[PDB]
């Protein structure tokens, strides 16, 4: 059953903390991520967040309480938020495995080092 909820068209300057501050009391959830400024349609910038609910009777209250809730940006502009089911219902599931032993090794990689000099003579 559908459990992933997106709240979108939030102000592009908002933070995850300001959003949860407006969201309390927040129901129980597995998932709570926050994205912003990652669109390809500049300068139409917005923020969004995804929440995956444990029980699905909370979503109807969450929608009835926040679909239309007006947020404000840095300059007083109104941002009526939209609350819908996320079109992709898959959500992250903990830290399943250990780290890839190669992450953070690009700083000493030879191929990346030759690029740094070509970036000195751009």
């Amino acid at each position: 059953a559908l459990s992933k909820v997106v709240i979108r068209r939030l102000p592009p300057t908002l933070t995850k903390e300001q959003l949860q501050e407006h969201l309390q009391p927040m129901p129980e959830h597995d998932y709570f991520e926050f994205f912003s400024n990652d669109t390809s349609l500049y300068p139409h910038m917005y923020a969004r967040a995804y929440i995956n609910f444990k029980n699905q009777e909370d979503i109807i209250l969450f929608r009835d309480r926040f679909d239309g809730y007006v947020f404000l940006d840095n300059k007083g502009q109104e941002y009526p938020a939209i609350v819908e089911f996320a079109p992709f219902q898959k959500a992250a599931k903990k830290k399943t495995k250990k780290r890839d032993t190669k992450v953070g090794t690009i700083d000493d990689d030879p191929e990346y080092r030759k690029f740094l000099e070509s970036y000195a003579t751009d």
Binding site: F35, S40, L41, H44, F88, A92, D100, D107, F115, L116
Partner: protein
Amino acid sequence: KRPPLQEYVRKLLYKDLSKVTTEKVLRQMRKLPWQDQEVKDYVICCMINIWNVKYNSIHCVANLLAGLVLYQEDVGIHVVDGVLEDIRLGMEVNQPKFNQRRISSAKFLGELYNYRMVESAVIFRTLYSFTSFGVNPDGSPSSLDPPEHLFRIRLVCTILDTCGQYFDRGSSKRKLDCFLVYFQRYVWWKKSLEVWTKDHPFPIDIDYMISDTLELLRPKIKLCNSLEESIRQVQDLEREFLIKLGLVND
């Protein structure tokens, strides 16, 4: 005038992916500081901006991400969430200068199904939104769907070009069959508008785009020759939905 690590990520995705093997690119991508949230978000944003990639190499990006999720599992979910967010925002903005970027992301989403990053539910969810979001059930023009705006037809055909060939067996076969019924009505809604006259004819390249795509997926499909014929198809199909749902009988 850009941080070197940012230019390197753009080099791997927007330059190297067409020229070198994607596995060599994956070897380098794993070495990035994925434990840094700013870098992880830049790679995700780089892939949401798929419009920077040549149209013929967009599928190499999905092939790369499908190996990346073996080492950074959550990255593929964020990229899909962002591409679907951009597709919805594209219909809300709907400015013609973003036509190539919105075509790219639709092609990307189809490729993401081809490399099993999403299942058919996401594809059909997006396909139906192209024919319903900001669209009047009347069929009359809307502010988000003005009469000469035929971009929904090209968005639908872009996805059906990329991933529609796989909806030929099983439950996905019926899902496409039902959608093509609703798609033929949407097509004849646009063709029925008063704006299309002998002085201002319906674009024949859109006509060929429609039949080219539908003949690629279904050889024995019947292309409707009128709006009344397309409405009758939807009514007969919805009568079947009524029989199966028992809203009147059962």
